[PDB]
């Protein structure tokens, strides 16, 4: 993936 995904909380 080009970006990491932050936690939603």
């Amino acid at each position, epitope marked *: 993936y080009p970006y990491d995904v932050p*936690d939603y909380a």
Partner: antibody, heavy 120, light 114 residues
């Protein structure tokens, strides 16, 4: 089928160190965040750490911040929790759990857990 | 930190009876992005991890009997069992899953009346 297996649980000396690991299977590891959550002898549940899917964001509550490091190895499908400066109150069953990166519904998938006992 | 108060702490029941559990939170659990209350309810039985029962406050997980209903909004949340079964004897935990730090209630334990 989604499966999480924790290991590393042991008796720790006062102020000692310990590293837990959790082997993931039955899903694409690299596409989901992961967490550690612990349950103390009094049965209270406490969130310990969360990691992003790529490993670049980590989160901790104040109770373990500076002492606990959550990491992952996406090639080996393994989640890690390195603990430092452990105290008796860190005694708990430690569970790894998947973070529902798509649905955002809480912890649907938990391992069976590993016991950590810390001397006072 | 968000604090979750579960009452009562334990509750003695008779099979068939309606039960009502309460989770009150110190702050709102509204995910502003999508207007859902990110409160999750879990069920724990001896020798096993907590089991997700209800999410987004009111959506039943797959395979959970429809005698379990989650409800409420803002700060006041309830878990109802329309007709309690001996297989539902367990500790019930609510969880703030909306904002760090993630926090759990202390649990409501269901026990059978002697």
């Amino acid at each position: 089928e989604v499966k999480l297996v924790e290991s590393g649980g042991d008796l720790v000396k006062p102020g000692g160190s310990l590293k837990l690991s959790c082997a993931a299977s039955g899903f694409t590891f690299s596409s989901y965040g992961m967490s550690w959550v612990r349950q103390t002898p009094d049965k209270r549940l406490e969130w310990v750490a969360t990691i992003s899917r790529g490993g670049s964001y980590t989160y901790y509550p104040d109770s373990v911040k500076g002492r606990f490091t959550i990491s992952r190895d996406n090639a080996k499908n393994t989640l890690y929790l390195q603990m430092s400066s452990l105290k008796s109150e860190d005694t708990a069953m430690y569970y790894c759990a998947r973070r529902e990166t798509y649905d955002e519904k809480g912890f649907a998938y938990w391992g069976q857990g590993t016991t950590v006992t810390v001397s006072s | 930190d968000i604090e979750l108060t579960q009452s009562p702490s334990s509750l003695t029941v008779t099979a068939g009876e309606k039960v009502t559990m309460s989770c009150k939170s110190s702050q709102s659990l509204l995910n502003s992005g999508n207007q859902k209350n990110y409160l999750t309810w879990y069920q724990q039985k001896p020798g096993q991890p907590p089991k997700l029962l209800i999410y987004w406050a009111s959506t039943r997980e797959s395979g959970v009997p429809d005698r379990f209903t989650g409800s409420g909004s803002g700060r006041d949340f309830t878990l109802t069992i329309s007709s309690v079964q001996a297989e539902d004897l367990a500790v019930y935990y609510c969880q703030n899953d909306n904002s760090h730090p993630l926090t759990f209630g202390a649990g409501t334990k269901l026990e059978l009346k002697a």
